[PDB]
Every structure is written in structure tokens, then in C-alpha cells.
Amino acid sequence: DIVMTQTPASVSEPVGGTVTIKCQASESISNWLAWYQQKPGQPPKLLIYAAFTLASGVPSRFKGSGSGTQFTLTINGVECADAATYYCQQTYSSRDVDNVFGGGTEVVVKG
């Protein structure tokens, strides 16, 4: 019933820039939202839950913004250590849903 898409497919920007990711919904999901990061050969880890609250032990560089339909994940500064795939989870209604998580967005940092 709920379907999402994650854009961009991939990003690339030097060490001093800011990388941003859009997670948009077919219909509004309110604040209910979560952002996940997996290193290669590593299970994903929660970074932003409720679309605003920082997780535990995560540095204060990842910003979640937006509410309802459009959500943005913005990183103030990269250090070539956040080069991984990020996903957004609906965590709102999963009665008949093909995938709670969205598309994959791999971050590439050229240092």
C-alpha cells in the first residue's frame, strides 16, 4: 500500500562538501521515518530515527529534515568514512507492503 523511492542513486563530492539524500513517499507518513547505513560486509546501522532524532553513538554531522511526504538526509561534512549505502524505512504502515525500506544510495568520497 505504501511505496517509496530513494534518490539520488549515487553521489560524489570532495571532503569539504555536504551530501544530501531525498526520500519521498507516495502518501504522507508523518514523522515516522528512519535512516539506515551499512558498510560493505557489515549489517546496516540506524543513524536517524523519527526523521529527526540522532541515534546513539553517531556523530553530529548527519541531519534529517522534512516531514510528511518529502524527507532529506543531509551530512554537513564527509571524512571519507561515510562512503556506504543509505536507506529510508517507512516504519508507518506495513500491512501489505512489498518492502519497508526504499532504494539504495551509495556515497562515494574521493579524497
Partner 1 sequence: KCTLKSFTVEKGIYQTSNFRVQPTESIVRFPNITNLCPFDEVFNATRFAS
Q: Interface with partner 1 by CB under 8 A: which residues?
A: 28, 30-32, 67, 92-93
Residues 6+ away with beta carbon under 8 Å from 94: 2, 100
Closest CB 106 distance from partner 1, rounded Å: 30
Closest CB 30 distance from partner 1, rounded Å: 3
Closest CB 14 distance from partner 1, rounded Å: 37
Cβ distance to partner 1 smaller for residue 31 or 72: 31
Cβ distance to partner 1 smaller for residue 74 or 93: 93
Cβ distance to partner 1 smaller for residue 11 or 51: 51
Closest CB 92 distance from partner 1, rounded Å: 6
CB burial string 36-67: b at 16+ within 10 A, e below: bbeeeeeebeebbbebeebeeeeeeebebebe
Query: Quick one: DSSP state of residue 16?
Result: T
Cβ distance to partner 1 smaller for residue 31 or 85: 31
Rounded to whole angstroms, the Cα distance separating 91 from 42 reads: 22
Phi-psi region of 95 (alpha: psi -120 to 50; beta: other; left: phi over 0): alpha
